[PDB]
Amino acid sequence: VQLQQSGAELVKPGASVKLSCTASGFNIKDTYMYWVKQRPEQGLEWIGRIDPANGDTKYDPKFQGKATITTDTFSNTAYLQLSSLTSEDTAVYYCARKGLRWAMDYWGQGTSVTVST
Amino acid sequence: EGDVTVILNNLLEGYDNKLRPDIGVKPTLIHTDMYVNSIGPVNAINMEYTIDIFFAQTWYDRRLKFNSTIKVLRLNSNMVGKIWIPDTFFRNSKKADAHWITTPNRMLRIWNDGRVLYTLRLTIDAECQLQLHNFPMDEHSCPLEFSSYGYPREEIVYQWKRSSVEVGDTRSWRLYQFSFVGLRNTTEVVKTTSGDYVVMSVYFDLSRRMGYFTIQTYIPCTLIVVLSWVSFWINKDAVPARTSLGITTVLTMTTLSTIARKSLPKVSYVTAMDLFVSVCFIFVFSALVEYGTLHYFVSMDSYARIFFPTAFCLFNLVYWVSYL
Amino acid sequence: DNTTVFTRILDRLLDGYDNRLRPGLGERVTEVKTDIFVTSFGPVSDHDMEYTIDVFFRQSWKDERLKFKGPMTVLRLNNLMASKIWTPDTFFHNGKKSVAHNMTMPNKLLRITEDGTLLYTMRLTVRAECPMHLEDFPMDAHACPLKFGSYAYTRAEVVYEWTREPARSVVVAEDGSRLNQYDLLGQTVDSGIVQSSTGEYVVMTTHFHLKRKIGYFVIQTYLPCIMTVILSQVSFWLNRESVPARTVFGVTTVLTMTTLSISARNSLPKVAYATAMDWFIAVCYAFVFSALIEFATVNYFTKRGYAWDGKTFNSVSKIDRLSRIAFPLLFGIFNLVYWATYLNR
Amino acid sequence: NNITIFTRILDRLLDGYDNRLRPGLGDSITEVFTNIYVTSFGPVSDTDMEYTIDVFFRQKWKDERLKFKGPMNILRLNNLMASKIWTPDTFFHNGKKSVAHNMTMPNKLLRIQDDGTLLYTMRLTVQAECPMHLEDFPMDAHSCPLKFGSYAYTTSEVTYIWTYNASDSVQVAPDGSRLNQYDLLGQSIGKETIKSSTGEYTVMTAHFHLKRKIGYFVIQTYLPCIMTVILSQVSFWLNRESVPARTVFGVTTVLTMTTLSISARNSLPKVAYATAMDWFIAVCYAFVFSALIEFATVNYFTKRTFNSVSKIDRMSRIVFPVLFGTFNLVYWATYLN
Amino acid sequence: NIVMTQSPKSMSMSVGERVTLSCKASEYVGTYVSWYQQKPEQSPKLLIYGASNRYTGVPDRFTGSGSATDFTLTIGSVQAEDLADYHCGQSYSYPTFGAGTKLELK
Amino acid sequence: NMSLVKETVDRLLKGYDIRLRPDFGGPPVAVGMNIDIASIDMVSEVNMDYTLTMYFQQAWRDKRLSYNVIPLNLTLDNRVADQLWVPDTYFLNDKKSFVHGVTVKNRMIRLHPDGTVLYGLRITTTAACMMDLRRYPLDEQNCTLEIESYGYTTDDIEFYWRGDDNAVTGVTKIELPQFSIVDYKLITKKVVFSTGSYPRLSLSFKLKRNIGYFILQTYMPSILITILSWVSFWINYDASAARVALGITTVLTMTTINTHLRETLPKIPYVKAIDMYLMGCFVFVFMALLEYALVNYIFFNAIDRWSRIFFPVVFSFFNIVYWLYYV
Amino acid sequence: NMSLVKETVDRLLKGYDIRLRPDFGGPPVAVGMNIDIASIDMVSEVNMDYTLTMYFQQAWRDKRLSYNVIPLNLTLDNRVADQLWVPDTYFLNDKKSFVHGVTVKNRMIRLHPDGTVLYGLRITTTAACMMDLRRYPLDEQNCTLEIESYGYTTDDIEFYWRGDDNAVTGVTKIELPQFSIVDYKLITKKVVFSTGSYPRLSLSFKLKRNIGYFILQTYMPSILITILSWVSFWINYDASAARVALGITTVLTMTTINTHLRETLPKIPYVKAIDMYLMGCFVFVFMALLEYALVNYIFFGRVNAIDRWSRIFFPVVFSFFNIVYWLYYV
Ligand SMILES: *[C@@H]1O[C@H](CO)[C@@H](O[C@@H]2O[C@H](CO)[C@@H](O[C@@H]3O[C@H](CO[C@H]4O[C@H](CO)[C@@H](O)[C@H](O[C@H]5O[C@H](CO)[C@@H](O)[C@H](O)[C@@H]5O)[C@@H]4O)[C@@H](O)[C@H](O[C@H]4O[C@H](CO)[C@@H](O)[C@H](O)[C@@H]4O[C@H]4O[C@H](CO)[C@@H](O)[C@H](O)[C@@H]4O)[C@@H]3O)[C@H](O)[C@H]2NC(C)=O)[C@H](O)[C@H]1NC(C)=O
Ligand SMILES: CCCCCCCC(=O)OC[C@H](COP(=O)(O)O[C@@H]1[C@H](O)[C@H](O)[C@@H](OP(=O)(O)O)[C@H](OP(=O)(O)O)[C@H]1O)OC(=O)CCCCCCC
Ligand SMILES: *[C@@H]1O[C@H](CO)[C@@H](O)[C@H](O)[C@H]1NC(C)=O
């Protein structure tokens, strides 16, 4: 029903960032978790997916070795992990779930990352 | 699901499925309906055709009446064996079977009033008496007759709906050499030794396309007998040449008669395809004795060179017009 | 007494359970998630417009009446538990005679996860119906379908879905390639809604793209037809005075041609129209018939009856000197245009 | 009433009865008395090496728990009673696909007597295996067997004995003789012990001696092969100069011998040896092929005052018919006898 | 990998007439094509799940057409609350998206 | 009224012993047999059997199934047969048979108020029928279906054709293209086995094979090959390649026809009547080729002109002898 | 010693849960396999399967069926299998299989007193076997049979051959009219599907094909119609009707033999080794007919030298063709 993400953050290039997406009104174990990259004045870009029943994970071929997802069933929240982030990756990150016909029906409010001085 | 469960447990208590609804009051009116998925191959050597239907029947049962906010109880095939089902059997079916994968393909929907819809998927090899006069330009009305088995006219009365028999694609049907013309639904009362029963019939009108027969039987045998007429253009002193042409035509026309008989079953009467074979056989047999009678007059051929084609040219006008 | 703990759990899951009702009957729509593992794609019978396929038809749905708390989480149960609970009545829309294998036990399993998620896979051989268009025979390509969906439950009660992504939800095993004539290229899936008199149902259609290998028909129909035309066209290299010799060429070539015309469509159904193999045979019939009437032309113009011994012998004919070059040429032109217009489609 | 007297008898017999245990399980042996009444001997499928037999398989054993003292001597019962008592698990060792007919009711017989003797008569359509050695085809003689014994009980649990004398224990009905290729000469039985992986098993056996009637293969294989050899020997009586006629005699008779060679082995299985029929066609091929070989020699020695009658052709009108004549005397007396 | 091309990049029409969006796939996607709008500095939502199957809550003017390769989004009458760019996605494989299509009102 | 029927039927089935026949230990029951021949499907000579689809019907009287209040003919569902005593009637020459089960099992039970139990089935069977093909195809078969009780001797059950000949109907209406039903016989007997004597009813059909098909696909394609062999008599003697190629072909055509006829027949050892014709016509063809070999031996017209009259005399005399002994 | 056996069996089956495997929630059970090959019936190349009749036997150890009082291997009736747990073993390449049901269902249960259950069943199966016919009929087939558990993974059941090689007996006396069993192997392996890792035993035979049927029926006519075409070199050149009617019949026989020998085979695309020989002989037959047309063209329009050379060349090359053919495929 309601999808919640944490607020925006300011990070240095070469550091690591942690971003969370809290789900409410529904459990995570039955639906996939879809996270997607939205650059400014540009289209969407899917980065990876999560099957929380067995912990299965598949990434985008471009973002292989770039992102990592862990998911806690008790916390009802799945976590980002951007290890080697650069200054070019200044965008907004959106949370989504698998819908009726493999669509993304419920979306989060979006958290924008900013890599500057 | 606690509301639907106490409904279904109350319907099935004090219920005897051995007794039809209104056993001693009035006959049960069962409005049948049929959706034809595909009509299979029409077998001529064994005289049946295959049909795949969604046979649906709808009756009134006052014992299956409930008063609640739920209107329709859409159940699975488990509830079929606990209630009364009419014993509809297809009296012209050689063998038939329902489909049981992955679950028995049966549907049961019960309305609050007591209306009961029962739909199942069937594959029926139905007996069709294909008359084989005018083969291969046949035209049949293949029937499908179904009735109750044990319950007579005083106990079950069957009936057709206005929007009843429904043909679907009519494009992907396995009728290869045939073509679906039309349908008509009739009803009748038959009298047997156990009483009077109500028989519902669906007549499927099928006409044959000439199709494979014309390219395998007609055109090959005519090109054989055209080849019988090039002997006249060969000179008369080439005696082993023309009698080698003579023997090979009549043996293969005998062979093609036996080959074309393999498609037909073991019927006694003659067909239009067999008539065309026999007339083509007596032109080539007359062509051998034409050549033969020439051989001892020298020990006229041009008259024969045109006569045979001409006589076959007028026959093809006689044969095709009279049978089409 | 170690197994009495799992005895109490299983009997509690069936106490008060009504297996005539789908789960979430008055609340929601029961999503049945399905995927297929094709162990072996069986032989395609073109004579009956059908094909056989052996599948591991997996299904998965969620039942909230089967929650339990115990030692393990997933119960890899026996087969007879599956008949005591609700199972979806998935049937194949274009199946003809499909068999669930029964040796030695029934070939079904049932796993009940501790949150109530179910998995129910069956081993089934499906003799589905594949509508074909045998017009480009034998160089045709077909998309044989396999449509399955619910029978007694409409689209407001049971909806189907693929478990994994639709690209990787129908998986073909590498060792199972029981096609002997065809050649499986790939599989594609789809989902849709069908309309019936009873209501609207969710259909799940998957297509198996098949391409026929023409290696059998080259060495059975094409090469004996090509070698027959060459056998008819050697008749122009003989002499004009060998009537009995050349009429054996003119008769036995077309007589073995019309047997191949019969024996080519034997396996083919009662095809109403004419296939592309029948067009090659019909042109090859014209090439062996024109060779005979070429001999009928030159025999009419043969004046004398004796032959060269070195008297005035018959001089060779312009008809035989022109048919020695034109007849292998126009058959070469037809052979170049028939294969190019069909193998590159 | 009088029926309820017999209801209380059958309810008393099955009270405390356990059909999972054989009679005398921990005490002694369980003797089973067996008879076979062959109603009809079905057709011997020569291709699949099998035959079909319709039997009335009667079994008879003693159960001490089924003893009653009533106003009846035996109880002629129906098939439903048979599924609530112990019956021996008799199966056929060489059966391939056997069915027990159940139209319109199951074909079983139950005749529990006063002392506990039981009778169990079934109607079967056993399709057994018959190993065949076709080295003397089509004059072979096969004693197609039929072997049956228990499946789960060893020789220390269930033993078999034929009921009558061993000669007249397998009776064949005279009117049921559906053999078309063969004819039943007689039957002989035996009783042997087979030691399998799970113990010794008493195996009852019965062999049905058979002999092939040659008369089918005379009309379709032997006489067409003989008549085309005589047809090829007509070519020695023709003119030497007639080259295109004796070629047609030589080639077409060789052609149909190849056609007869393919068509004769049609229904035959694909055995790795050569049958006596195939040993006949090969010699019959040697007479039809050497006629064409000799015609090449006569055409080699021709020169044209005219030609002359060949002395090689005149000797072939005497040597070739009596060489085939002496071969038919050898072949139809060696293999036939 | 699957790529989705949305044409055109942008357009400018007024209130209450017809617009035809376009979205063409690289290879076969059957029906699993999703349409998402993006209101500026808000979250995306779902217009049509699958092909020609309207979501709950969106008005009836939004409709789609589906095939093997090409997919169209059609609005019968453009309103003043449709100030968003529309993204065409796919779901037959691992999901990918188009570049979107902006629009503006006079 | 409907609740009254439930109390009556439950009264009938309470205390009912299915294992015991009616009047057990006393007089036998009389069971009437009624067979309605719906269709005779495949009279196959290769497997020597015929396929029969009939509405088998039985009628006996059980005193336990007697009701008094309802005068109507109680017609119950087909699933009460598992709780009622039915006779164990089997067919002796049955190869394979089944009861049709669409949409339910084809079965009727109608309880009459005097205790009469009406038990009717729709049975498709493949009864075995041995055929004496010594006069094929001008023959006349006699295919039987033998109804017998299995477990009950005559003292327990007795069989009879209820309604005399009317017991079996629809036998004549059967449409057979190859065969032709002439007469059906209803015979009642008591076959005695080693276990006792058993009643037996036997329904037997008299079938006559139609030669109309054979007279156009065999006899004629043959008698006319001998006419082609008679063309070689008229041909001049110096045309050796003409007469030999004509004479070889008429031998080999009839040889192939003989082999193309017995593969659709069982491998019987005796000589069928169509094989006496083909071997009879083979001698006339072979002597036509041997007539030329005598001619070429003489020269290298008096002999040639004698065979042009003798052959139409003897062969026409052979057809007079053939179509007077088999017809 | 009768009621003691009855109260012991009824003690065993009371409280028995057929829905639970032995040692449920603990270690996997060990199931020994004892296959007894009874008869291999029809190795049909048309349907690509072989029919196998065996005495499949399963041996596991259930701790709940541990009677003791009675010192006897307690063989029960075959209808107690409906009340005991059995493994759900299926054959993967099974096309159609059945258990024989005359006079009862062929099934054996023997409860050993330590809990061991002997479970032997007479099973006739039609296992699918994909065949490589590129060397037909001089080819050796390798047909398998995959015994596999269905519902239980590797951590719930394990399969092993009981007695190692002895596990499979009776294969030496198996006689195939067309084939001949050369070798048989026993493999224990694990396969991984998407639902887990499941045990699998495979019994596989190596079938060599006997040449004897094909050598006299297919090869011996085919070496010999070419001999008839070699008689055409001995006939004089002016006899045009004799040599052509000899030359056509050897062509047309080899074509009809080629068509009559492939309808009993599946519609495979590659060239089987009997087709290479029947097309190799067709080239030699067709070149003999083309040899005459070369001779007839030389003499009318424009010798005996070609005929006498082809009387020596053709027996050399064709005998060299058989040396190449019967040293490469055999
Ligand atoms: C002589 O012996 C033969 C055996 O060789 C007997 O034939 C058997 O008859 C029984 C009784 O009818 C059959 O059992 C029933 O089978 C139902 C479906 O099974 C189908 O699957 C097999 C798979 O191999 C198919 O081959 C069959 O199709 C063939 O047979 C039919 C019938 O002859 C023909 O019409 C066809 O043309 C084929 O030739 C079978 O159709 C099965 O649903 C049913 O289950 C019921 O079990 C008991 C029975 O009272 C009850 O608990 C309950 O009624 C079950 O049904 C409930 O549940 C299902 C859902 O599971 C619901 O759909 C129902 O509505 C209901 O609520 C039963 O198991 C058996 O299959 C059949 N075997 C063969 C090989 O034919 C003859 O009857 C016998 N003749 C006599 C005694 O006269
Ligand atoms: C399927 C073909 C159907 C063709 C049908 C039409 C066939 C058609 O029209 O034939 C007539 C003629 C026959 O020529 P061909 O050479 O066969 O016959 C010569 C011709 O008859 C001369 O007139 C004769 O000389 P004369 O005057 O008696 O002294 C000569 O005798 P001789 O010199 O030995 O003494 C004969 O050999 O052919 C053409 O002119 C070429 C046509 C090419 C047509 C195109 C061919 C591709
Ligand atoms: C026959 O069908 C039509 C509709 O196709 C229907 O109106 C008519 O009532 C039906 N007749 C019968 C027998 O009820």
Domain coordinates of chain F in residue numbers?
Answer: 2-208, 214-325
Co-location of B269 and B120 in the same domain = no
Residue with tokens 């019907």: F57
Q: Are F290 and D249 in contact (CB under 8 A)?
A: no
Which residues face E46 on adjacent strands? Answer: E36
Which helix (H) or strand (E) segment holds residue F302: the answer is helix F302-325
Q: How far is B309 from chain C (nearest CA, A)?
A: 16
Q: How far apart are CA A74 and CA D198, in angstroms?
A: 57
* Reported structure resolution in angstroms: 3.2
**3-state class of B212 per DSSP?**
helix
Q: Are B88 and B146 in contact (CB under 8 A)?
A: yes
Mutation for testing the F interface, residue in B193, B276, B288 having most F CBs under 10 Å: B193
Please choose, from the candidates F282, F297, F185, F283, the residue with its C-alpha nearest in 3D space to the C-alpha of residue F240.
Answer: F297
The helix-helix angle for F273-299 and F219-234 (nearest 10°) equals: 10
Q: Are D37 and D173 in contact (CB under 8 A)?
A: yes
Q: How far apart are CA D309 and CA A7, in angstroms?
A: 121
Give the tokens for residue C2.
């170690």
**Partners of residue G268 in chain C, C-beta under 8 Å:** 180-181, 215-216
**3-state class of B137 per DSSP?**
coil
**3-state class of F293 per DSSP?**
helix
- Determine if ligand 1 sits within 6 Å of the CB of residue B78: yes
Domain boundary (B209, B244, B278) is at B209
Its sign, for the CA torsion C140, C141, C143, C144, is positive
F26 vs D231: CB contact, 8 Å cut-off? no
G103 vs D299: CB contact, 8 Å cut-off? no
Q: How far apart are CA G212 and CA D259, in angstroms?
A: 19
Mutation for testing the F interface, residue in B80, B144, B266 having most F CBs under 10 Å: B266
Please choose, from the candidates C202, C204, C184, the residue with its C-alpha nearest in 3D space to the C-alpha of residue C193.
Answer: C202
**Partners of residue F17 in chain D, C-beta under 8 Å:** 3, 6-7, 10
Residue with tokens 């060397």: G135
Displacement of CA A21 from its chain's centroid (Å): 7
Which residues face G202 on adjacent strands? Answer: G146, G187
CATH number for the domain whose boundaries are D216-334 = 1.20.58.390
Domain coordinates of chain C in residue numbers?
Answer: 4-211, 215-343
Nearest to F271 among D177, D219, D237 (CB): D219
Co-location of B169 and B68 in the same domain = yes
Q: How far apart are CA C180 and CA C173, in angstroms?
A: 16
Give me the half-sphere count of Cα atoms (radius 13 Å) on the Cβ side of residue A96. 26
Q: How far apart are CA F251 and CA F253, in angstroms?
A: 6
The stretches of chain C forming alpha helices (DSSP H) are 4-14, 215-217, 223-233, 243-264, 276-300, 318-343
D21 vs G169: CB contact, 8 Å cut-off? no
Please choose, from the candidates B142, B168, B162, B148, the residue with its C-alpha nearest in 3D space to the C-alpha of residue B29.
Answer: B148
**3-state class of F28 per DSSP?**
coil
Which helix (H) or strand (E) segment holds residue C34: the answer is strand C30-45
Q: How far is E67 from chain A (nearest CA, A)?
A: 16
Domain boundary (B193, B209, B225) is at B209
Q: How far apart are CA B91 and CA B88, in angstroms?
A: 9
Pairing of strands G157-161, G89-91: unpaired
**Partners of residue E36 in chain A, C-beta under 8 Å:** 44, 104
CATH number for the domain whose boundaries are D3-213 = 2.70.170.10
Ligand 1 atom 72: the closest Cα is on which residue?
A: F101
Q: How far apart are CA C229 and CA C225, in angstroms?
A: 7
- Determine if ligand 1 sits within 6 Å of the CB of residue B80: yes
Residues in the annotated binding site of F: 90, 149-150, 195
Q: Which residue of B has its CA nearest to F244?
A: B240
Which helix (H) or strand (E) segment holds residue G11: the answer is helix G3-13
Please choose, from the candidates E30, E31, E36, the residue with its C-alpha nearest in 3D space to the C-alpha of residue E89.
Answer: E36
Rg, Å, chain C Cα set: 33
Sheet holding D199-212, edge to edge: D90-92, D141-150, D199-212, D182-196
| Gaps in chain D (C to N distance exceeding 2.5 A) after | 304
Q: Give the list of residues 6+ apart from residue G56 with CB closer than 8 angstroms, or none.
A: C104, G33, G35, G89, G120, G121, G123, G147
Please choose, from the candidates D138, D183, D133, D181, the residue with its C-alpha nearest in 3D space to the C-alpha of residue D335.
Answer: D138
The stretches of chain B forming alpha helices (DSSP H) are 2-11, 211-213, 219-227, 239-261, 272-298, 301-323
Give the tokens for residue C254.
């077309």
Task: Confirm or reject contact between B276 and chain F (CB < 8 A).
Answer: no
C296 vs B245: CB contact, 8 Å cut-off? no
Q: How far is A63 from chain E (nearest CA, A)?
A: 13
Q: How far apart are CA G34 and CA F29, in angstroms?
A: 53
N-term to C-term CA, chain E: 38
Domain coverage including residue B300: 212-323
**3-state class of B239 per DSSP?**
helix
CB < 8 Å & 24+ apart, contacts of C72-75? C72/C114, C72/G25, C73/C113, C73/C114, C74/C111, C74/C112, C74/C113, C74/C114, C75/C6, C75/C9, C75/C10, C75/C111, C75/C112
* Fold observed for domain F2-208: Acetylcholine Binding Protein; Chain: A, (2.70.170)
Pairing of strands F74-76, F107-111: antiparallel
Q: Is C259 left (phi over 0), alpha (psi -120 to 50) or beta?
A: alpha
Nearest 10 degrees: Cα torsion G44, G50, G53, G57: 180
Displacement of CA C35 from its chain's centroid (Å): 22
Q: Are C13 and C65 in contact (CB under 8 A)?
A: yes
Q: How far is F2 from chain D (nearest CA, A)?
A: 30
Method: cryo-EM
- G154 among the known binding-site residues? no
DSSP-derived secondary structure letter, F14: T
Q: Which CATH architecture has domain G3-210?
A: Distorted Sandwich (2.70)
Q: How far apart are CA G139 and CA G135, in angstroms?
A: 5
Buried b (16+ CB within 10 A) or exposed e, G99-120: bbebbbbbbbbbbbeeebbbbb
G99 C-alpha to center of ligand 1: Å? Answer: 17
CA distances from E30 to C190, C313, F75, F258 (A): 5, 77, 55, 61
Q: How far apart are CA G284 and CA E91, in angstroms?
A: 61
Greatest alpha-carbon span in chain D: 118
Rg, Å, chain A Cα set: 14
- Per CATH, the homologous superfamily of domain C215-343 is Neurotransmitter-gated ion-channel transmembrane domain (1.20.58.390)
The stretches of F140-218 forming alpha helices (DSSP H) are 214-217
**3-state class of G23 per DSSP?**
coil
Q: How far apart are CA F163 and CA D173, in angstroms?
A: 32
Nearest to A30 among C62, C159, C166 (CB): C62
**Partners of residue B252 in chain C, C-beta under 8 Å:** 255, 258
In chain B, % helix, strand, coil (3-state, to 5) comes to 35, 30, 35
Please choose, from the candidates B165, B148, B174, the residue with its C-alpha nearest in 3D space to the C-alpha of residue B204.
Answer: B165
- C237 among the known binding-site residues? yes
Please tell me the total count of domains within chain E: 1
Please choose, from the candidates A39, B174, G193, G276, the residue with its C-alpha nearest in 3D space to the C-alpha of residue C219.
Answer: G276
B174 C-alpha to center of ligand 3: Å? Answer: 27
G118: amino acid identity, one letter: L
Q: Are D146 and D206 in contact (CB under 8 A)?
A: yes
What CATH number corresponds to the domain at position E59?
2.60.40.10
Rg, Å, chain F Cα set: 31
Q: Are G184 and G205 in contact (CB under 8 A)?
A: yes
CA distances from F123 to F39, F55, F100, F105, G50 (A): 11, 6, 7, 11, 35
* Residue C177 CB neighbour total at 10 angstroms: 15
Q: How far apart are CA C321 and CA C299, in angstroms?
A: 14
* Residue D190 CB neighbour total at 10 angstroms: 12
E91 vs C165: CB contact, 8 Å cut-off? yes
Task: Confirm or reject contact between B227 and chain F (CB < 8 A).
Answer: no
Greatest alpha-carbon span in chain B: 108
Co-location of B166 and B243 in the same domain = no
CATH number belonging to the domain at F214-325, selected among 3.40.50.300, 1.20.58.390, 1.10.150.80, 2.60.40.10: 1.20.58.390
Co-location of B129 and B64 in the same domain = yes
Give, in words, the CATH class of A2-115: mainly beta
The helix-helix angle for D278-301 and D311-334 (nearest 10°) equals: 170
Q: How far apart are CA C331 and CA G208, in angstroms?
A: 45
Q: Which chains reach chain G with 3 or more Cβ–Cβ distances below 8 angstroms?
A: C, D
Nearest 10 degrees: Cα torsion C149, C155, C160, C161: 140
* Residue G128 CB neighbour total at 10 angstroms: 23
Question: How many residues are there in chain A?
Answer: 117
Please choose, from the candidates B131, B134, B138, the residue with its C-alpha nearest in 3D space to the C-alpha of residue B322.
Answer: B134
Ligand nearest to the CA of F124: 1
Q: How far is G27 from chain D (nearest CA, A)?
A: 28
D115: amino acid identity, one letter: D
The stretches of chain A forming alpha helices (DSSP H) are none
3-state secondary structure chain D: CCHHHHHHHHHHHCCCCCCCCCCCCCCCCEEEEEEEEEEEECCCECCCCEEEEEEEEEEEEECCCCCCCCCCCEEEECCCHHHHCCCCCEEECCECCCCECCCCCCCEEEEEECCCECCEEEEEEEEEECCCCHHHCCCCEEEEEEEEEECCCCCCCEEEEECCCCHHHEEECCCCCCCCCEEEEEEEEEEEEEEECCEEEEEEEEEEEEEECCHHHHHHHHHHHHHHHHHHHHHHHCCCCCHHHHHHHHHHHHHHHHHHHHHHCCCCCCCCCCCCCHHHHHHHHHHHHHHHHHHHHHHHHCCCCCCCCCHHHHHHHHHHHHHHHHHHHHHHHHCCC
Q: Which B residues 96-155 touch F at CB under 8 Å?
A: 96-98, 120, 122, 124, 127, 129, 149-152, 155
Co-location of B284 and B199 in the same domain = no
Q: How far apart are CA B252 and CA B223, in angstroms?
A: 12
Ligand 2 atom 44: the closest Cα is on which residue?
A: C319
Q: Which A residues 6-45 touch E at CB under 8 Å?
A: 34, 36, 42-45
Q: Are G240 and C242 in contact (CB under 8 A)?
A: yes
* Residue A62 CB neighbour total at 10 angstroms: 10
- Per CATH, the homologous superfamily of domain G213-325 is Neurotransmitter-gated ion-channel transmembrane domain (1.20.58.390)
* Residue G146 CB neighbour total at 10 angstroms: 18
CATH 2.70.170.10 fits C4-211, yes or no: yes
- Determine if ligand 1 sits within 6 Å of the CB of residue B97: yes
Mutation for testing the C interface, residue in A57, A58, A100 having most C CBs under 10 Å: A100
Co-location of B83 and B113 in the same domain = yes
**3-state class of C256 per DSSP?**
helix
Question: How many residues are there in chain C?
Answer: 345
Please choose, from the candidates D202, A101, D301, the residue with its C-alpha nearest in 3D space to the C-alpha of residue E48.
Answer: A101
Q: Which residue of F has its CA nearest to D255?
A: F252
**3-state class of F127 per DSSP?**
strand
Please choose, from the candidates B284, B286, B285, B291, the residue with its C-alpha nearest in 3D space to the C-alpha of residue B237.
Answer: B291
Co-location of B227 and B288 in the same domain = yes
Q: Give the list of residues 6+ apart from residue C215 with CB closer than 8 angstroms, or none.
A: G268, G269, G270, G271
